[PDB]
Amino acid sequence: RKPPKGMFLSQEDVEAVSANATAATTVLRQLDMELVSVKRQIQNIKQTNSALKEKLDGGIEPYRLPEVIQKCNARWTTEEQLLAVQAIRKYGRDFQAISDVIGNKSVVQVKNFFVNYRRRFNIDEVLQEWEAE
């Protein structure tokens, strides 16, 4: 019902190696050429990616900033409010980035902050005008 295991005998393949006298060596030569074509295309992208590797040698070690570890504080200094209004105008609703900018407020605090100072800081307008970017 099935060929011995390892042997590959599909009704499709047989009638393709029997279509003519040389239809066998024809089929087997396209594959040989096809394998050679893939091998070169392999070494082509192997050298393309060897060049790209060289371009980013050194990674980004020189451009990293040390880590500021700060304790999420509760009170909004007048300074920290002002950082917020500008963070909103540059980031909109990305609270995680906005906290990252302030450095001592949590996303929850930032989330609350829009609701609390929404009228006093025209946060609707700010967002509204951030949307034009």
């Binding site: 019902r1 099935k2 060929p3 011995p4 390892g6 042997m7 590959f8 005998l9 009704q11 393949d13 047989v14 190696v17 029997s18 066998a24 089929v27 087997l28 594959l31 040989d32 096809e34 394998l35 893939v38 091998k39 295309q41 392999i42 992208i45 192997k46 393309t48 990616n49 790209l52 590797k53 371009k55 980013l56 990674g59 980004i60 020189p62 451009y63 990293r64 900033l65 300074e79 002002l82 950082l83 500008q86 963070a87 540059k90 980035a97 990252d100 900018v101 302030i102 450095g103």
Partner: protein, 665 residues
């Protein structure tokens, strides 16, 4: 075991009745199952008695004595069973001291063309049925294709050599009646490449297992894909193997293509990662500058200038985070390419060294079938493996000629008598033969019936070596053209000293080329004396016949030298090279199931010919021309046992015709 082993050892099913028995006993088969089992017993029990001592005739009286009740109640049932068995050579066949000596006066006259084993087997049976039999033999000896070389102590069969197992083999019976020195055969066959050095066990098991694998593949190809016709021509075995190999070479290449295709897929995936990482590093390098400039505006500053430092700092750690997640991902792809480039699939299907070793297993198969694999029928070439005997294979150390010579005893044989024409008519037959030594002494033999055991090679000969008058009908001559008559030859090498491994019976030599795989590809150490036999198979056989003995023995010496060392190989004292296709009384070696033929042809060959009426409108005549030989038995062609069985078969049929069958009632 017991009575049921008697049925097995007689190629009979112990619990069922055969088509032949249904013919002779239609009363019993159409009747109640109890009587069937009684019959089936009486058959098996009589067979057992004959088998337990086949050096003495088994008379009906002796038979009825030995079987008990309820089975010895129906004396005619017992008499019928015995007579059926005796007639068709299932009992009292071969060389048996008989109790009841021959009828003083005989009945009917039979001419048997050929004193090869099929011939002798019939002749002994007919003579033991009270008929007058004469065998016409072209050669100066009996045995036909059972030939045996003898000179001094040196003994080696140029013809048949091997009993293929005693399980269910009639030659087992003959082996008790004739002392044949039956030696077992150790099948360990170590190979040796052209260089002269053993193939290592790793390859030997590998290549062999691929060989057997390639065979089952053709079977699958024939049975499940019905790949048996191609360009309005029957597919051979050779064609089918080429297809299977090509498709295994194709799959190796398909496999490689997909493996490399997986690699370039990830390399392209990598490519787009680096592009994304160069372009990100460039942005990071810019932002850092922007930040360090904004950070260098010394304080105290206003809150926008402070926002600039902070935001640029966020923006930079944000891109620095991306670039780290991309570097982690880059390492993942980087190791994959190491994994794949380190797990490549098979480079090739079979190397040239491997293919040459495979070519030897093919030569061995070409040798067993005595023909190039391009001539064997794909569908039917193995149609007789179902009836293979059980047990080890054996040689005859004292020479296999001992058996026909034994059968020829007490028979009227005309040696050096070549039949030239066979004439059969509604009133009898005349066979016309000449003397081989002087071709003008002409002989005329008149007879009731002719048994033709002419080799299929001879019946195939164009122009005819034997004319049939009237000609054979085309249903028979077309069977003769369709069937295959193949060829294989032996070189007998006779030394004064044993320089080979005495515990290896047989060892191979791997050929240079596909085309020459059969040239001396195997060697036999089967005999007491220092004899090594080299064999020629496949396409090589027909070509080695146009090369002198000295050149042929030359090549054997060279091959042997490479194996055992240029100094351990003496010259041979006695050399003999067979040339069986050249032999005019054989014109080949034995039959094969050619592409376009089938096992039905072997039955066609066995049909007797019945001449037309001489007087027009006179009643339909009796058959006059009968045939036997290895090419006439569908389940056991190309063997000695098969020839012998066919001789027994005709002797029963001829006797039924002329002596009459009284056991059918």
């Amino acid at each position: 075991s017991g009575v049921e082993g008697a049925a097995f050892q007689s190629r009979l099913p112990h619990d069922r009745m055969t088509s032949q028995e249904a013919a002779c006993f239609p009363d019993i088969i159409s009747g109640p199952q109890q009587t069937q089992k009684v019959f089936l017993f009486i058959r098996n029990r009589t067979l057992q008695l004959w088998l337990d001592n086949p050096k003495i005739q088994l008379t009906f009286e002796a038979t009825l004595q030995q079987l008990e009740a309820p089975y010895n109640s129906d004396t005619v049932l017992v008499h019928r069973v015995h007579s059926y068995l005796e007639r068709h050579g299932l009992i009292n066949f071969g060389i048996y001291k008989r109790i009841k000596p021959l009828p003083t006066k005989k009945t009917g006259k039979v001419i048997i063309i050929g004193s090869g084993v099929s011939g002798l087997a019939a002749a002994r049976q007919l003579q033991s049925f009270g008929m007058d039999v004469t065998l016409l033999e072209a050669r100066d000896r009996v045995g036909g294709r059972v030939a045996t070389f003898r000179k001094g102590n040196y003994v080696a069969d140029l013809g048949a050599m091997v009993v293929t197992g005693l399980g269910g083999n009639p030659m087992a019976v003959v082996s008790k009646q004739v002392n044949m020195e039956l030696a077992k055969i150790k099948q360990k066959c170590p190979l040796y490449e052209a260089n002269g050095q053993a193939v290592p066990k790793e390859k030997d098991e590998m290549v062999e297992q691929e060989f057997n694998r390639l065979l089952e593949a053709t079977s699958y190809l024939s049975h499940q894909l019905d790949f048996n016709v191609l360009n309005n021509k029957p597919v051979s075995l050779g064609q089918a193997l080429e297809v299977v190999i090509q498709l295994q070479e194709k799959h190796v290449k398909d496999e490689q293509i997909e493996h490399w295709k997986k690699i370039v897929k990830t390399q392209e995936e990598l490519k787009e990662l680096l592009n994304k990482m160069v372009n990100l590093k460039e942005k990071i390098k810019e932002l850092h500058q922007q930040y360090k400039e904004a950070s260098e505006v010394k304080p105290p500053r206003d809150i926008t200038a402070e926002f600039l430092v902070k935001s640029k700092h966020r923006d930079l750690t944000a891109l620095c985070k991306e670039y780290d997640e991309l570097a982690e991902t880059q390492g993942k792809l980087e190791e994959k390419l190491q994994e794949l480039e380190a797990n490549p699939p098979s480079d090739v299907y079979l190397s040239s060294r491997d293919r040459q070793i495979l070519d030897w297993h093919f030569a061995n198969l070409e040798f067993a079938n005595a023909t190039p694999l391009s001539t064997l029928s794909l569908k039917h070439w193995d149609q007789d493996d179902d009836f293979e005997f059980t047990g080890s294979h054996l040689t005859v150390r004292n020479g296999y000629s001992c058996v026909p010579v034994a059968l020829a005893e007490g028979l009227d044989i005309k040696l050096n008598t070549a039949v030239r024409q066979v004439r059969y008519t509604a009133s009898g037959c005349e066979v016309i033969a000449v003397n081989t030594r002087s071709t003008s002494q002409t002989f005329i033999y008149k007879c009731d019936a002719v048994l033709c055991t002419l080799p299929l090679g001879v019946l195939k000969q164009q122009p005819p070596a034997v004319q049939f008058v009237p000609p054979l009908p085309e249903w028979k001559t077309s069977a003769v053209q369709r069937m295959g008559f193949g060829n294989l030859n032996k070189v007998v090498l006779c030394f004064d000293r044993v320089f080979w491994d005495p515990s290896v019976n047989l060892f191979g030599h791997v050929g240079s080329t596909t085309a020459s795989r059969g040239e001396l590809f195997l060697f036999w150490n089967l005999y007491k004396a220092p004899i090594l036999l080299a064999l020629v198979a496949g396409e090589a056989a027909g070509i080695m016949e146009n090369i002198s003995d000295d050149v042929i023995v030359g090549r054997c010496l060279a091959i042997l030298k490479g194996i055992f060392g240029s100094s351990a190989v003496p010259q041979p004292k006695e050399t003999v090279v067979s040339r069986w296709r050249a032999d005019p009384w054989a014109r080949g070696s034995y039959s094969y199931v050619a592409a376009g033929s089938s096992g039905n042809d072997y039955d066609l060959m066995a049909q007797p010919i019945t001449p037309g009426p001489s007087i027009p409108g006179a009643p339909q005549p009796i058959p006059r021309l009968f045939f036997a030989g290895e090419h006439t038995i569908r389940n056991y062609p190309a063997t000695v046992h098969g020839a012998l069985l066919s001789g027994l078969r005709e002797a029963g049929r001829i006797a039924d015709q002329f002596l009459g069958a009284m056991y059918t009632l």
